[PDB]
Symmetry: D2
Subunit: 326 residues, 4 copies
Amino acid sequence: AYRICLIEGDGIGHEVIPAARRVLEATGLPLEFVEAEAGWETFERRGTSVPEETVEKILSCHATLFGAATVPGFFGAIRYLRRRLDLYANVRPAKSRPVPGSRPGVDLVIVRENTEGLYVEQERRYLDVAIADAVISKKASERIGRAALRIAEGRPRKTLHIAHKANVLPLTQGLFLDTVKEVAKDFPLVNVQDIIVDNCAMQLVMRPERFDVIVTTNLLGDILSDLAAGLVGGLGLAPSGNIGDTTAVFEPVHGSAIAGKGIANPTAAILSAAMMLDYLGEKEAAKRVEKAVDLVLERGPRTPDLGGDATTEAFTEAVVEALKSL
Amino acid sequence: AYRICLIEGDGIGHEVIPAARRVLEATGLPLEFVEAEAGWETFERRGTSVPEETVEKILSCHATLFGAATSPTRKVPGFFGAIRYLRRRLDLYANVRPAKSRPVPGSRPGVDLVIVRENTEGLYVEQERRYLDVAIADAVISKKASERIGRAALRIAEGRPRKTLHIAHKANVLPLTQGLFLDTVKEVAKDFPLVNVQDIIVDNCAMQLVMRPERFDVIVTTNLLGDILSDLAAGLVGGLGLAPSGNIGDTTAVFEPVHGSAPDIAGKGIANPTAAILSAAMMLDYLGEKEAAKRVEKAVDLVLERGPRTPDLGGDATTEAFTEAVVEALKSL
Amino acid sequence: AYRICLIEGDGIGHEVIPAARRVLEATGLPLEFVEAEAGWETFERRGTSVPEETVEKILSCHATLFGAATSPTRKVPGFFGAIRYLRRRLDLYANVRPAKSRPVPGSRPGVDLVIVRENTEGLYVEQERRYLDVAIADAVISKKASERIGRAALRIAEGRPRKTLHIAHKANVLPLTQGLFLDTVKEVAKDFPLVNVQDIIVDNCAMQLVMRPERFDVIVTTNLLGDILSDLAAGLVGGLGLAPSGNIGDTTAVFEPVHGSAPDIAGKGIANPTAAILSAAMMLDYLGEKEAAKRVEKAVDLVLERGPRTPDLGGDATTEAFTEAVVEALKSL
Amino acid sequence: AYRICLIEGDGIGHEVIPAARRVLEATGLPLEFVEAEAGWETFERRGTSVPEETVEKILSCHATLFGAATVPGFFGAIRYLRRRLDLYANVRPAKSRPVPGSRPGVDLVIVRENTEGLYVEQERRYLDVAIADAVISKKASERIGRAALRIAEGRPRKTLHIAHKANVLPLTQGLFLDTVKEVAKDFPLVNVQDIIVDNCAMQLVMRPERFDVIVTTNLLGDILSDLAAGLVGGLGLAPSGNIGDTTAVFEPVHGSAIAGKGIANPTAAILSAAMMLDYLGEKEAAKRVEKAVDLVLERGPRTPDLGGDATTEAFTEAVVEALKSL
């Protein structure tokens, strides 16, 4: 059976992760769970955001699902995990959901590298001048390009756009662009197009339907993904994954927010669980989960963040029920 | 009188600059035009995209209006971008890019903002280097550069109705560079108590621009962030076809359309002069002729709404017909 | 009276500092000594090599005399070099290292120079970074740092008989960094017309120091170059065993022997206090007691020449015997 | 036979290179020569310090001997050759010569990397702050370490000192040190010692006999070699080599200086020719040349730079004669 490590994290995480677990069990898949701790609240009790035991648990499982995160000695749990486990592929999908305030027809995935697994981009200040290093290496570019190509090859469109800034940064961005295009020769089935990041941002706003998979570098991926989230309902419903060569951690994009009341929308956590299923090779199960979520978002109840007043537990129940009817 | 340097540039620049000139002349303001050459076509004839005489003419005028520049696919030895060169040579550090709703197909209503970011090359070229399999690009922030750009943005904000400024940054991930930028602008902001200043992480700014663009007026940010935010904003209003822009320094400024030279349609007389005319309006504002600038903008909006419309806006009218309509409209506004 | 902070440090520091104190007391000058702790032994007991109280005591005195610091082979978490920390914390930017002939075995005659280089950490730590198989180290030069160090060296040169200063640089290969350094020092040199200033490529300086050291008096250079030039110069005069040094800032200074703590002989009473005594002489010079400084140096030279000599100089005398001889000699000089 | 490319260069080069050629012929070895042009004087006539034809000639020969070198469009010939041909190993020996003003018993070789074959260390200035990059890579360190180890293995002492600054620059200098020591495992016959560069400088002054082969990085090698030259007679008699994986260029260390009169000391050029012979595998011939040079420096005439008044041509004749008697 699949071993899934569950980490609630802080605040709303305590509500959306158990919800995600519920939906996962509803799929009927042979699943096992291992609870672990991480985050600010874990720091206050353990002295560290990511206890050594947590890393061990993560490594003992096929995949990890993380809820949310919210001083000397403290460090970002997710940032630490990316570096410690070299989860180099940051995967952020943007898909139209049947919710008021969402552009229809949008269905893309943005892939960018999590650099710290290989190196930390250093900042330095000398008197009145501060300098930040933007680093691109052939190795890192080959890895993320191959990761993006595989993702595109597993999607209907078989289309990949390389969003770059080689026009103004020929050495760094050019190395990125050229390397991804080189790796692309190994994926003749994938249609690869190059696009300046600025133009990509404008086209995401004007006609996002144009994109399927987009691969880009660090700082650019961030803004493009947030721009895209703005088009389909905000970060509130956005799932994400951090995939390495041995394991992966999935989590909602938005912070830990409210909370405690039980009005947190578990959509992102559930869709992150769906991303995890896809990653594990259970694509059909992932599609059913996603469908069930859409059905509820469309007809079923709705949590506060979506105009409704339904509770996290109520919304989750509907999904479970809907999932069972599919 | 005001001395205005006119540089047509390449392709459609030869059509939209003369059109913008006509609109400026229609204001009746005391303007003396000085023509100069710059661009790819100029390079092909002189070995440089920006002759020394052109720099001299720009410096001899109050402001400059530039058309378009052709950028060849492959790199041509000796050829460098004219606007990039002028930004550096004259230290036109304030890159000003408005994003505003227009009465045209595809433009979302309720958008009226201005994004301000620095052009760094007047002070320093951010260097790139490659060592074997590793390439590194410097992102440079200095107190001096941040103070200047912050003050420029605050001045623009104070000159607008909303008196609102947002500082878009990434100090959450780049505390030393982005933090220096943020802290410095906030420091200069103390001198502009009439302007409501708010800080916003660039990523969140991007999302909010797509969801609630009406919350912004003036946004000041750094190098690469401004680029993407402006293109994002342009997407909301239909694209870059009608967008004007400015590069302002301490002693002069150059204004120009964001759109390229469109070589394949140059000479056909169908280019939309809106961007060039609105760039001329930005120039009038800069020169202190704010009322005339507003009238020019109103004339443009009236024609955009009622026609004649050039091909890019779904019409079949010529550059000439459009220009004459703006000139005629201006007289009654 | 002059407030002097005494920090024995580790190992032989416990023997040479008290000796230097005795020599200072032998001058009869109005000196008030304030003891403070710093070093490895201090770290082992307090978790820090430089307690806050020590920094406070240093700041409360006119100058500080430091003995020696033990540097363990392997890196010990939490332990940092005391002198390095003080240079940074108090911005003791002027690293002053004299190289002078002494009447001892192995010392070449005719050497009398002072090498001045900046300690950069008071302004900034030059960062290193590694990306995969490539490592990069920043060599940083600023106008501010160069102006300060240049002025410090020029002041030292003007306070010496020869009134001669050489600027050792590598602007021939590093025009931007080394050139900024060179040009800046030459600019400040304009204010010292009494000092004869010459520029010299560091490589040539190294060669000339070995062949004709008498041509130099004061040499000002950058970070890593000063290090090697001083050790080269030390080689000419017998080594680093008798060498004093100073770290001078705008408000105070710390002087100390270049020699280490020699842990294995600590407590045996055979350490040569020459370096510590000469460091005390540098301190007197710095404090404005130039005549006393010269007398202390003469007393040291007399004993070095006639004995008693400690083991390091081929003798079999104790630290105590040597110190008493210097004290007695000082009275007649 | 061996094909040797001869490049006189500027000034004194016109006198010392023909002299070196003379001594080479005197060895009796099957030699052939190919004249090429390079330098300032070549720039004034060709428009470039290193004509393309010169590079072609160099590549067509087993080794190259260069005399000396002395504005937009102009660039250092030697610097260009190092980069163009990737002559990464800069070899500079320091040996006591029987001349007044030379410390006896000194016999060492300093090896440092010529970096530009792989990359140019960039300088940058931002307002009042200037920054220069000091770059160390595993590849460059492995190459120069192996080069230094081979040189030490071919010498009696079988001793190598790695002069570094890892104490204050742990990342760059530490990578250098660690990499050379790793490559050293492949040379169990060579005794390898580590030494801080500052201490190395002091020990070169106090007791240079301690050293045989010294391997160090860029900026340090320069000063150590000039320091060493100061101990054995100055740069005037110092030879040098720039060795790559396919070819090598040898030349006197000192500039092009005087000249025209014919009072230039051809010692450095001749010893550089000796270094070249060693490089070609003619060690015995190289030793004879060196011996002949010493014999003349000791008893025979002496050029102005050495107190004497002998001419370049006279000094050379003596060496040839002396070489013939050996």
